[PDB]
């Protein structure tokens, strides 16, 4: 179990009172598990904030969430584990330049191929996990950042979407 500390994910900021009417994933935002395999395999399209679990995330218009702003380029993310799991790897997507904001997230509306993916070839990590990822700079305003964590034992992954502002000028 685990969640995007920084830049504060959607349901971290459930947590933190930022975000409302999120549902139960306020009192745990490390426990957005659902099916791995991503994008090959994972939650249903529409289903992917909430990884079939939690519903309520999975809402998607341009005023319901909170956004976090964030320069294209060089990003630092850290993830916070409650529970370190042995780990196949770690995956950042991100929404296609023109993607329908007002609409549930599907595969369809990301870039497929993540702008950052890091292979732990199995190996358990520490509490705090750290990435340094370069956010697309030909995109702008509201997108969504798909944080993945794939479980290497359990056929399962963990989904963080982040509501992001982006700048890239
Ligand atoms: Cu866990």
């Known amino acids: 179990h685990g969640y995007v500390e920084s830049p504060a994910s959607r349901s971290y900021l459930c947590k933190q009172g930022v975000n409302v009417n999120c549902g139960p994933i306020q009192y745990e935002p490390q426990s957005v598990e659902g099916i791995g395999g991503f994008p090959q395999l994972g939650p249903s399209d529409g289903q992917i904030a909430g990884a079939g679990h939690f519903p309520a995330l999975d809402v998607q218009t341009v005023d319901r969430w909170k956004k976090v702003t964030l320069n294209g380029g060089t990003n630092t993310f850290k993830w916070k584990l409650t529970a370190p799991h042995s780990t196949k790897e770690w995956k950042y997507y991100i929404t296609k330049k023109g993607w329908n904001p007002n609409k549930p997230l599907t595969r369809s509306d990301l870039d497929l191929v ?5 292979n732990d070839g199995g190996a358990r990590p520490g ?27 359990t056929g399962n992954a963990f989904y963080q979407v982040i509501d992001v502002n982006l700048l890239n000028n």
Request: proline share 6%.
């Open 114 to 118: 993540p702008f950052y993916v890091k």
């Open 127 to 153: 509490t705090t996990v750290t990435h340094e990822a370069n956010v697309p700079t030909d995109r702008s305003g509201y997108h969504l950042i798909l944080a993945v964590w794939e479980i290497a034992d």
